[PDB]
Design a protein around this ligand. Structure first.
Ligand SMILES: CCCCCCC[Se][C@@H]1O[C@H](CO)[C@@H](O)[C@H](O)[C@H]1O
Ligand SMILES: CCCCCCC[Se][C@@H]1O[C@H](CO)[C@@H](O)[C@H](O)[C@H]1O
Ligand SMILES: CCCCCCC[Se][C@@H]1O[C@H](CO)[C@@H](O)[C@H](O)[C@H]1O
Ligand SMILES: CCCCCCC[Se][C@@H]1O[C@H](CO)[C@@H](O)[C@H](O)[C@H]1O
Ligand SMILES: CCCCCCC[Se][C@@H]1O[C@H](CO)[C@@H](O)[C@H](O)[C@H]1O
Ligand SMILES: CCCCCCC[Se][C@@H]1O[C@H](CO)[C@@H](O)[C@H](O)[C@H]1O
Ligand SMILES: CCCCCCC[Se][C@@H]1O[C@H](CO)[C@@H](O)[C@H](O)[C@H]1O
Ligand SMILES: CC(C)C[C@H](N)C(=O)O
Ligand SMILES: [Cl-]
Ligand code: NA
Ligand code: NA
Length: 503
């Protein structure tokens, strides 16, 4: 079985797994929608009581499974719990990352296309003071790129360029994945991570240089880092915070587990996991939180910035920010840097969310790396057309897989690993070979606090939380996908059998 060549490579690979579009696109919006500072407290708490422990747990399960030649949850869950229902539940470990990849890769392709067009200077030309006269051109830019519906039909009409760019994006993901773990994901990580850091820092500085009659970036920072204790009793804020934690730390996606399955049986996972998580958090609250929000607040003020954040999920990153940059000298190239950053983050995450499927095809169905990668890319590519041509399909997929699925699957994996498999055994497995030991209290946090916290979370959210019929188009399909995957697992367990009878 493949293994991470170096420690640094491992750390940067995991960090590249976590640090993605969620840091620079999702976080700003989530924090802005929930009152900025009022969103941080729960966030921080969610990081301590959920993020860290689940990270460690997934690292542990990953390494454990990898020691026996398994990297995906269908087999790992069965190793931890000898029950068919464990395999069935394990299917989600492939389903979630697949579905998420299906749209994630597309958004990534967006970032790539924008990078290209901004580099060549093929961008909108806003009339040199009316805010709408400046934003409108960019909004039209995006809408024309992805093909936002102009009528009543829920149909998207992506430009030829966007499609070709998606093709190329897929080709790059494949070019990285086909070289494997050490020569592919690791090697690339060692470049993309530094590059990403540099770009992010530069952008942060440039943004900090912004000042208008409406305010400065410091106002944005203040908006983001000022506590509001009157929202601590609001369930919604907590739900948002935890969701953001899950998404940003790649928890419940089966990606961390698969990546960890390539860590040598003896190699530490405590300090490594903690370091990756910490890196992601620094890239999120410090870098991702000091770009979009501070700029939007500097140019429009707090209220208007919040309004923009609530507008949508892509408004701030693909429309507002580039529009703001266009008002400065070298703003186009600045936009280029922005979208390039976004592209690298995206890529480094996407490869991570396709590696699970690849690893299932390799480990369980005994496919070669080439064939596994190619078939995975085929499934993703084909499935992506639904996201490309059906309006709000992306939203549905993101809700069922990227929101519900990750939390439910987190609770599931926690229950299987720390309850069924054994709390003491799980603790032992986690701390084994650790450069540092997990604080004693975290035993009680993992066994009692985290599971109850989640459970309560899911129950409250489901109880307190009207769509277009076309949603059923997506659901259906993804459901199918699940079934598909299930069947594969079946085939797998059959092959195993036939293999056992022959040995
Ligand atoms: C390096 C080659 C990159 C240039 C390819 C651009 C193909 Se995208 C091109 O861009 C125009 C400006 O937004 C759009 O209005 C037009 O509709 C679209 O075809
Ligand atoms: C998920 C199923 C998606 C397959 C639909 C393929 C669209 Se087919 C092709 O595509 C263009 C792009 O919008 C259309 O405008 C054009 O009218 C149509 O001929
Ligand atoms: C899997 C169902 C077949 C889907 C056909 C592939 C998309 Se069809 C492809 O799409 C581009 C982007 O809209 C169009 O601009 C181009 O004219 C059209 O040929
Ligand atoms: C490297 C990025 C890929 C660049 C692909 C550009 C080819 Se897409 C570009 O879009 C125009 C708008 O329809 C077409 O009329 C034109 O023929 C076509 O070249
Ligand atoms: C899965 C999402 C399906 C949307 C793809 C539509 C391709 Se284009 C679609 O084609 C129809 C004729 O077939 C036209 O009447 C309709 O106005 C046009 O939107
Ligand atoms: C940056 C990573 C891709 C994120 C794409 C957003 C999925 Se779409 C976004 O998702 C929200 C869920 O929090 C919905 O509430 C919101 O209405 C929808 O626009
Ligand atoms: C939410 C959990 C907070 C994590 C804070 C961990 C610092 Se807890 C720290 O851990 C040491 C090793 O167990 C103990 O010996 C020491 O007494 C205790 O202060
Ligand atoms: C689904 C995950 C790969 C997302 C990633 N952790 C991000 O923050 O962008
Ligand atoms: Cl375009
Ligand atoms: Na992240
Ligand atoms: Na990434």
């Amino acid at each position: 079985r493949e293994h991470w060549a170096t420690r640094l490579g491992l750390i940067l690979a995991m960090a590249g797994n976590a640090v993605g579009l969620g840091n620079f696109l999702r976080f700003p919006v989530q924090a802005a929608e929930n009152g900025g500072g009022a969103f941080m407290i729960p966030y921080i708490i969610a990081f301590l009581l959920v993020g860290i422990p689940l990270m460690w747990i997934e690292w542990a399960m990953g390494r454990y499974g990898g020691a026996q030649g398994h990297g995906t949850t269908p087999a790992i869950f069965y190793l931890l719990w000898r029950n068919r229902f464990a395999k069935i539940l394990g299917v989600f470990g492939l389903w979630i990352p697949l579905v998420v990849a299906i749209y994630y890769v597309y958004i990534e392709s967006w970032t790539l296309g924008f990078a290209i067009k901004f580099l060549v200077g093929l961008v909108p030309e806003p009339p040199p003071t009316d805010p709408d006269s400046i934003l409108r051109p960019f909004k039209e830019f995006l809408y024309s790129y992805i093909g936002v519906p102009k009528g009543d039909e829920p149909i998207l009409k992506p430009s030829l360029f966007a499609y070709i760019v998606f093709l190329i994006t897929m080709f790059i993901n494949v070019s990285i994945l086909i070289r494997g773990i050490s020569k592919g994901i690791e090697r690339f990580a060692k470049i993309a991570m530094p590059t990403l850091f540099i770009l992010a820092v530069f952008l942060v500085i440039r943004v900090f240089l912004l000042e208008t009659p409406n305010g400065t970036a410091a106002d944005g920072l203040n908006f983001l880092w000022t506590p509001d204790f009157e929202k601590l009793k609001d369930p919604g804020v907590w739900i948002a915070a935890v969701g953001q934690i899950f998404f940003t730390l790649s928890l419940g996606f089966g990606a961390i587990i698969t990546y960890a399955s390539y860590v040598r049986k003896d190699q530490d996972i405590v300090l490594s996991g903690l370091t990756a998580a910490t890196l992601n958090e620094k890239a999120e609250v410090i870098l991702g939180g000091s770009i979009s929000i501070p700029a939007a607040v500097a140019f429009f003020g707090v209220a208007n910035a919040v309004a923009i954040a609530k507008a949508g999920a892509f408004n701030l990153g693909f429309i507002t920010l580039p529009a703001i940059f266009s008002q400065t000298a070298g703003g186009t190239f600045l936009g280029f840097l922005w979208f390039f950053l976004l592209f690298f983050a995206g890529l480094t995450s996407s490869i991570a969310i396709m590696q699970p499927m690849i690893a299932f095809l390799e480990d369980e169905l005994k496919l070669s790396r080439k064939h596994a990668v190619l078939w995975t890319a085929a499934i993703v590519f084909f499935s992506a057309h639904l996201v490309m041509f059906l309006n709000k399909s992306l939203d549905e997929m993101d809700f069922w897989a990227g929101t519900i699925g990750v939390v439910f699957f987190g609770l599931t994996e926690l229950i299987i690993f720390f309850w069924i498999f054994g709390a003491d055994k799980a603790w032992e497995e986690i701390n084994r070979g650790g450069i540092i030991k997990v604080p004693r209290i975290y035993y009680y946090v993992m066994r009692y606090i985290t599971p109850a916290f989640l459970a309560v979370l899911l129950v409250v959210w489901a109880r307190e939380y009207e769509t277009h019929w076309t949603v059923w188009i997506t659901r259906f399909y993804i459901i199918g996908l699940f079934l598909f995957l299930t069947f594969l697992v079946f085939l797998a367990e059959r092959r195993r059998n036939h293999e056992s009878a022959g040995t």
